[PDB]
Amino acid sequence: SLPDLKIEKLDEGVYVHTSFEEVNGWGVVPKHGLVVLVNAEAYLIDTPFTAKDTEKLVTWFVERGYKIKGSISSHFHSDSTGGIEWLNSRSIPTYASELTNELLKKDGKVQATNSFSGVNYWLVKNKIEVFYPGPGHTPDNVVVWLPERKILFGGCFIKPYGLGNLGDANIEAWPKSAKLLKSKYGKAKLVVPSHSEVGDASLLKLTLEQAVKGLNESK
């Protein structure tokens, strides 16, 4: 049996949710996302793997008095988008980049109800920012920045000890994207990866080194 959904406070108004799925050739895979509170409204940063855990996550915050105002998915893989169909069924606004939605549509999967195009986007002005560093883990991966807390959710782009699943990866572009990401968020207090533990800004450097190492290996 897979471990249960975990919800843990990371900072004021910021929670980490961890869900688990068995993924072929990878084993049981932990997935971190965030829940961000702005007054009495909650925003999901990535959904858990499944509708089940997405519902558990939503009920947990609603039963504590937070309205779910929306979700954003950092890329098209199911560990970021698995709960979009369920959220859509509950009339909770779902967001993804235009390219993420395109890839979902291409894969015959449910798409977010809202989309954004361009390098920067405010999900919530001055509270929750989305940034596209360029292709890496996937062509569409984006990160989410919380300027009030100096917290960066790096998603599956942040890979400080190894690059993970390269099936949809762009190894040529990843070092360039990681360099850009590092320049932009060097002052992050915390960096939250999808598949390894929260760290500080050094995770940006480590990701860059792993990206460079990964590209070098392929030649």
Annotated binding site: 75, 77, 79, 137, 156, 159, 165, 195
Q: Which of 17, 77, 127, 159 binds Zn ion (CB under 5 A)?
A: 77
Q: Which of 17, 127, 159, 182 is flagged as catalytic? A: 159
Under the criterion CB under 5 A, does residue 142 sit at the interface with Zn ion?
no
Determine, following the binding rule CB under 5 A, whether residue 79 of this chain makes contact with Zn ion.
Answer: yes
Nearer CB in complex with Zn ion: 32/127: 32
Q: Which two tokens stand for residue 81?
A: 């988008």
Answer yes or no: 176 catalytic: no
Nearest distance, CB of residue 69 and Zn ion, angstroms: 24
Q: Which of 31, 32, 77, 182 is catalytic?
A: 77
Instruction: Specify whether 17 is catalytic.
Output: no
Q: How far is the CB of 38 from Zn ion (least distance, A)?
A: 25
- Cα distance between residue 169 and residue 139, in whole Å: 7
Q: Which of 17, 137, 140, 141 is catalytic?
A: 137
21 is a contact residue toward Zn ion (CB under 5 A): no
Residue 100 φ/ψ, nearest 5 degrees: -60, -45
Q: Which is nearer to Zn ion, 53 or 79 (CB)?
A: 79
Q: List binding-site positions for a beta-lactam.
A: 159, 165
In the set 42, 156, 163, 191, which binds Zn ion (CB under 5 A)? 156
Give the binding site for Zn ion (CB under 5 A): 77, 79, 156, 194
Q: Report the catalytic residues.
A: 75, 77, 79, 137, 156, 159, 165, 195
